[PDB]
Write a protein that binds this ligand. Structure first.
Ligand SMILES: [Mg+2]
Ligand SMILES: [Mg+2]
Ligand SMILES: [Mg+2]
Ligand SMILES: [Mg+2]
Ligand SMILES: [Mg+2]
Ligand SMILES: [Mg+2]
Ligand SMILES: [Mg+2]
Ligand SMILES: [Mg+2]
Ligand SMILES: [Mg+2]
Ligand SMILES: [Mg+2]
Ligand SMILES: [Mg+2]
Ligand SMILES: [Mg+2]
Ligand SMILES: [Mg+2]
Ligand SMILES: [Mg+2]
Ligand SMILES: [Mg+2]
Ligand SMILES: [Mg+2]
Ligand SMILES: [Mg+2]
Ligand SMILES: [Mg+2]
Ligand SMILES: [Mg+2]
Ligand SMILES: [Mg+2]
Ligand SMILES: [Mg+2]
Ligand SMILES: [Mg+2]
Ligand SMILES: [Mg+2]
Lengths: 153, 257, 207
RNA sequence: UAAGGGAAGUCGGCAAGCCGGAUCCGUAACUUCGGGAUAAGGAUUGGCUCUAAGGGCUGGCAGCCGACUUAGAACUGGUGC
RNA sequence: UACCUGGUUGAUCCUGCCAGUAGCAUAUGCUUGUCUCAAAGAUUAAGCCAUGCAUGUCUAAGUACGCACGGCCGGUACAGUGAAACUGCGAAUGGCUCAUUAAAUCAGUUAUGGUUCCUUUGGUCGACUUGGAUAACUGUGGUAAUUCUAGAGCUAAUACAUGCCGACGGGCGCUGACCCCCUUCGCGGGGGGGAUGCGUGCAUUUAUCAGAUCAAAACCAACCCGGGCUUUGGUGACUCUAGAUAACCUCGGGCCGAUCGCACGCCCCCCGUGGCGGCGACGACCCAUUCGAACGUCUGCCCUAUCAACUUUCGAUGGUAGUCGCCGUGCCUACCAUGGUGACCACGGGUGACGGGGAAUCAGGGUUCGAUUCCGGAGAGGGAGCCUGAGAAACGGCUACCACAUC
RNA sequence: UCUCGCCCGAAGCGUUUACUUUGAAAAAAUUAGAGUGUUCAAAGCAGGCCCGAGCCGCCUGGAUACCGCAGCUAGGAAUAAUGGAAUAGGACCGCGGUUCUAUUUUGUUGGUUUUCGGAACUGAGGCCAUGAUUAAGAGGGACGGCCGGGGGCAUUCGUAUUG
């Protein structure tokens, strides 16, 4: 649903269904989209009642350009997270390496549920979504390990 | 800066015009036209350096505008016109007639042809579209917006175009087996046989080729131009089958001479 | 002299982005189109590249689309409620891209009346305006043409939209920008978002 | 109350006169780290016309009725609060 | 050239440093015959400038009743060289300087499917001439002044405007008077051909719809026959392009030719008063091609911790709705959440930091410069502001303040 | 997998890199280097030959190279990192079914009920040699007979010294 002033994508809602008299189910007429380059659209997009302006599966924001990686470190931000990406930069003179990291922002499509902090993610390039958000969630590699555990409460 | 640049230095000019420094500070910047600044050659280089008709750059302003040197059968009167790959120069009364190819070392080679290549010419399609009122238009990289073309011309194909009608014929299509020639990049001028494409979904295609004697190379479809179907070019061809020899064999080409 | 540029911002950090422009030409921002509901008075503004741009200052018309029955009509604008981005332009009666507009119901009565007859908006007057629907009498198969239109579809519009046509009003939503294209074009609110913005207006007019 | 000047008056700024209430700002030397400190220095303040937010009692997510505060905006007066 | 010598003691050996040693690039001095290329107000003052200059422009083809020149000369006006002027481009390029600015310019990289583009290249380009002004000109003038400028009478246009002739209507969009049969006791019920009337196309801008890969049945209500019938292109991805449906279209009115040079020739007649058309110039509706421009992504930077937490009220990171702008975005404004960066050196300084491509030094590896022809950025005393233009926040453009500063 | 037209294309369409070698990709200028008697040389991209004019003249040259790091593609699987299956919610094969809807033939068109493909879900058996590298002259720990002017708490004691 919606908890804002209004959200509704592109689809013509008010189709004048009724000609003999029935309710049935109603939420069926939904938008849907592929993203190509060998990434499957999840079924979270299809039985997702949420509406998004910036999703790669739901919205108009197509993915051009690049492919990069990251690890999801902080999720304290609305509909977007902050990845981190270590790498091994090289120094010429010393003939050795040094670790660096550069924190990026990326718009978290909320179709990816249970994306919990610390798991590996893969991103794709888009338009300038915000001041820092130029990236977009493309695939969630790790389910944060334990797909089995039960604990106290 | 502000607006378009409109000069070109002699040092900053492309090397495949063979231009030389101490002649002067500046190089002839071509006009805007069908060929970009790295896929072109002016008339003023073609006539003053290679054929070596005129020695000043103001007489070429006279003989390009004495209405004698034309392109494709219509008169072009610029002194810095962008003549590029696969173009046809006619001279109307005094009969000389030219076809432009690449020299395989990287240069633009002179290649003198007859009236049976005034009748046709090849060109590579850049995009296909549909236009207004449902009809097809098809944009060729020689700046040819030519319509009602054919059904089976894919985007990356080659068209044997007449100059007089302006109407296509004998549309060869991209497929493995053909004879091809590289028009940009690190193996320019080579003529070879199409062997493998890879359709990456990373916004490009990439192409391995063999060649005549089988040897392998690699470049892209945009750079590449198709010249025939199965080891027979539709065009006549200069200095062998368009062959880079070896560095040392090119020396011993000159010794056995 | 407003510039919508991003070199007088801060970084990802907050360090002061030191200037090396002087607010150049191609990064202008012009003052806004404080659009009113007066008679037609449209300024034009030269663009980079020589194109033309149509400032909507005061406008009284607008081309809107009745989406369900697939009608689209030139129409008068009466009243402006619930801008949904500011709660203050509702006062000013100012049109922007998503601004919900009360619209007079005349050019949508007569389409639906002359197509899907025994029309709407007469409160059972019982002595009120017998206008050429009771005279034609439709001898031919055109009556039997219109009989499929009349009750087989049965053409029941959204429940409360009858009451807007009882009142001579119609609640719609713009979709064009006024000050950028010079039109105020949009579509009529139907069904789900009809009853959505209804309860928004009612409670804000209530309390 | 007093044009202009502002301690030149006198033993001495004596007495008068400035500053004051409030909100948002901003605060050093110095210190026993408690302070200094309401430091200094500022900005607003009217009128009216509105919006925004803070509740209470019953229900098989609604309906009746309640306190005076807090921010925002427009318009207006002879820059006046 | 993969290289050392002297200097601490009475003497040695040794960590050590100072001194020599060879380039290099600025100065400086002594000196100098010729010849080839040849750097050169960068370091301190991006301090100030006298002075002459550096941006001009015409084809047979926009405009000639010039007072200039004379073509052969008669009037059916307009033949040629045309000063000057309006008009169309162009002065936004090239030149100079390194003062700014430390993920910033830039460099290697990818993309606009998220935009604009003068020119150049092709497509589409379905009333036998309407109108006022206007310069050039003529004078008559003003204060010492400048490349100042006023009024009185005429005159041109691709300056400016106003605005129609071609046309056979194709068929859809949808109203609609009517017309042919079975049944029938009549109403009724069941199927079929067609006068009236408004729309018409491209672009602007809205809303909807169809926007496709499949291989077999029982009949039930009819009924085409002899048991049996019809379909745009592209990507990896579309809210792509193309269609179809409803309508606007902004008087500060998207286009849908009231232009010019070169020659002629054909036609059948009721004169020709009618027709019949080759080549080039010019400039416009958008689509493209090129020259671009811009905002983007990934990685990369000099010393400083005696700079350790910094950022948000006046956006600091993000969410939604929108203004704006060429389009994408806190770019601003509204509302709402409470985030972002940090020891992998952020933030705060310093810089004698324009960055690169490069240059010097020669084992290897480095070390120091790089303002300096090439590519890119910046600025024209400082700093703000805008007209014209496709292009400028232009300075051999304009306005205002400050600092200089002439008459 | 031969759904597409016994071998081939194509199609299901892969846990990643790091590293390594090829392959693209780059602007020249400058540098290494080719070639050329600019008179040699620093340069420069020049020239070489025949025709006594006599052919509306021939031939070649204006290369090659390294272009850090980063990004891309295709080969290599050693070392160094990282992953699956331990409450098994696993690998694999055949079955019960819920309910979702997909176009071709039922002359057409519609209707109803299906064979019917897949997404979803559900139930059950078997199937797999069904699954856990060994215990560092690495480390933590348990253990138990000793040992220590170790540490702290408390008391008992000693001669001296001064009074
Ligand atoms: Mg209310
Ligand atoms: Mg006084
Ligand atoms: Mg006074
Ligand atoms: Mg005073
Ligand atoms: Mg005093
Ligand atoms: Mg005293
Ligand atoms: Mg006192
Ligand atoms: Mg007083
Ligand atoms: Mg005090
Ligand atoms: Mg010394
Ligand atoms: Mg020394
Ligand atoms: Mg100066
Ligand atoms: Mg320049
Ligand atoms: Mg500097
Ligand atoms: Mg820019
Ligand atoms: Mg740029
Ligand atoms: Mg805000
Ligand atoms: Mg060296
Ligand atoms: Mg070195
Ligand atoms: Mg430059
Ligand atoms: Mg400038
Ligand atoms: Mg200038
Ligand atoms: Mg014992």
């Amino acid at each position: 649903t919606e908890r804002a002033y209004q959200k509704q994508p592109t689809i013509f809602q008010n189709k004048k269904r009724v000609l003999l008299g029935e309710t049935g189910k109603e939420k069926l007429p939904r938008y849907y989209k592929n993203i190509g380059l060998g990434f499957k659209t999840p079924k979270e997009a299809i039985e997702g009642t949420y509406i998004d302006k910036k999703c790669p599966f739901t919205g108009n924001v197509s993915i051009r350009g690049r492919i990069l990686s990251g690890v999801v470190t902080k999720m304290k931000m609305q509909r977007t997270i902050v990845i981190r990406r270590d790498y091994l930069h090289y120094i010429r003179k010393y003939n050795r390496f040094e670790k660096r990291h550069k924190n990026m922002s990326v718009h978290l499509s909320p179709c990816f549920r249970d994306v919990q902090i610390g798991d590996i993610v893969t991103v794709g390039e888009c338009r300038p979504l915000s001041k820092t958000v130029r990236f977009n969630v493309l695939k969630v590699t790790k389910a944060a390990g334990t797909k089995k555990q039960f604990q106290k409460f | 800066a502000r607006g378009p640049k409109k000069h070109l230095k002699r040092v900053a000019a492309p090397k495949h015009w063979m231009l030389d420094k101490l002649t002067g500070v500046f190089a002839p910047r071509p006009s805007t036209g069908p060929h970009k600044l790295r896929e072109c050659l002016p008339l003023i280089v073609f006539l003053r350096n290679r054929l070596k008709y005129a020695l000043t750059g103001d007489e070429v302003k006279k003989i390009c505008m004495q209405r004698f040197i034309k392109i494709d059968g219509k008169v072009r009167v610029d002194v810095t016109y962008p003549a590029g790959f696969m173009d046809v120069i006619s001279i109307e009364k005094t009969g000389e007639h030219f076809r432009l190819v690449y020299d395989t070392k990287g240069r633009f080679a002179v290649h003198r042809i007859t009236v049976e290549e005034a009748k046709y010419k090849l060109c590579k399609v850049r995009k296909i579209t549909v236009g207004v009122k449902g009809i097809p238009h098809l944009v060729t990289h020689d700046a040819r917006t030519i319509r009602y073309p054919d059904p089976v011309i894919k985007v990356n194909d080659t068209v044997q175009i007449d100059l007089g009608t302006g109407k296509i014929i004998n549309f060869i299509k991209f497929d493995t087996g053909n004879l091809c020639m590289v028009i940009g990049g690190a193996n320019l001028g080579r003529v070879g046989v199409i062997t493998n494409r890879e359709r990456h979904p990373g916004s490009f295609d990439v192409v391995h080729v063999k060649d005549a004697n089988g040897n392998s190379f690699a470049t892209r479809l945009s750079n590449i131009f198709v010249i025939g179907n199965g080891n027979k070019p539709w065009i006549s061809l200069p200095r062998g089958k368009g062959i880079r020899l070896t560095v040392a064999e090119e020396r011993d080409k000159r010794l056995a001479t | 002299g407003i510039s919508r540029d991003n070199w007088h911002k801060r970084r990802k950090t907050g360090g002061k982005r030191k200037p090396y422009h002087k607010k150049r030409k191609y990064e202008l921002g012009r003052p806004a189109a404080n659009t009113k509901i007066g008679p037609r008075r449209i300024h034009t503004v030269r663009v980079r590249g020589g194109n033309k741009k149509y400032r909507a200052l005061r406008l009284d018309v607008g081309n809107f689309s009745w989406g369900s029955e697939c009608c689209t009509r030139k129409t008068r604008i009466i009243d402006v409620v619930y801008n949904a981005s500011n709660n203050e332009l509702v006062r000013t009666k100012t049109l922007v891209k998503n601004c919900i507009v009360l619209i007079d119901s005349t050019p949508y009565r007569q389409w639906y009346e002359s197509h899907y007859a025994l029309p709407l908006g007469r409160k059972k007057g019982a002595k009120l305006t017998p206008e050429e629907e009771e005279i034609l009498n439709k001898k031919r198969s055109k009556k039997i043409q219109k009989k499929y239109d009349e009750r087989k579809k049965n053409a029941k519009i959204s429940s409360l939209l009858e009451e807007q046509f009882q009142q001579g009003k119609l609640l719609a939503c713009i979709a064009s920008r006024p000050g950028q294209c010079g039109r105020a074009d949009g579509y009529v609110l139907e069904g789900k978002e009809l009853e959505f913005y209804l309860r928004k207006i009612k409670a804000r007019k209530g309390k």
